[PDB]
């Protein structure tokens, strides 16, 4: 069952989130922006820390829980909601897509706060 929105580290430099949970296995999204079924052991558990904060080179404050615009990348060109933040990559959520949970990561370097 696990929980939705849980982030998992697939590798020492790759991160993914859970978009579709299943009893036979859990569907996690690869930081590359892909969805692949995985097992509890094939994934890890990490609690988000409110202190986890990042500063945008444009003098902008970014938080794991905030709204930012995405202009870099093929899906960029729209605004998303910052749900999970990891290193220079943050997991954004998009209600437009529900089949894959509308979860995708972007480079905070190109992410700009709308407000």
UniProtKB/Swiss-Prot annotation:
Coiled-coil blocks: none
KOW domain segment(s): 62-95
Record: residues binding RNA: 47
Post-translational modification: Methylated by PRMT1/HRMT1L2 and PRMT5/SKB1. Methylation negatively regulates interaction with P-TEFb and RNA polymerase II. Phosphorylated by CDK7 and CDK9. Phosphorylation by P-TEFb (CDK9) at Thr residues of the C-terminal repeats alleviates transcriptional pausing and promotes transcription elongation. Dephosphorylated by the INTAC complex when transcripts are unfavorably configured for transcriptional elongation, leading to premature transcription termination: dephosphorylation is mediated by the PPP2CA component of the INTAC complex. Dephosphorylated by the PNUTS-PP1 complex in termination zones downstream of poly(A) sites, thereby promoting deceleration of RNA polymerase II transcription.
Tissue-by-tissue expression: Ubiquitously expressed.
Binding site for DNA: 87
Effect after changing residue 46 to A: Reduces the affinity for Pol II elongation complex
Cellular compartment(s): Nucleus
Complex and partners: Interacts with SUPT4H1 to form DSIF. DSIF interacts with the positive transcription elongation factor b complex (P-TEFb complex), which is composed of CDK9 and cyclin-T (CCNT1 or CCNT2). DSIF interacts with RNA polymerase II (Pol II); forms DNA and RNA clamps that stabilize Pol II elongation complex while maintaining the nontemplate DNA strand in the transcription bubble and nascent RNA in the exit channel. This interaction is reduced by phosphorylation of the C-terminal domain (CTD) of POLR2A by P-TEFb.
Family: Belongs to the SPT5 family.
Its biological purpose: Component of the DRB sensitivity-inducing factor complex (DSIF complex), which regulates mRNA processing and transcription elongation by RNA polymerase II. DSIF positively regulates mRNA capping by stimulating the mRNA guanylyltransferase activity of RNGTT/CAP1A. DSIF also acts cooperatively with the negative elongation factor complex (NELF complex) to enhance transcriptional pausing at sites proximal to the promoter. Transcriptional pausing may facilitate the assembly of an elongation competent RNA polymerase II complex.
Name the record gives this protein: Transcription elongation factor SPT5
Gene: SUPT5H
Whole-protein coverage range: 533 to 647 of 1087
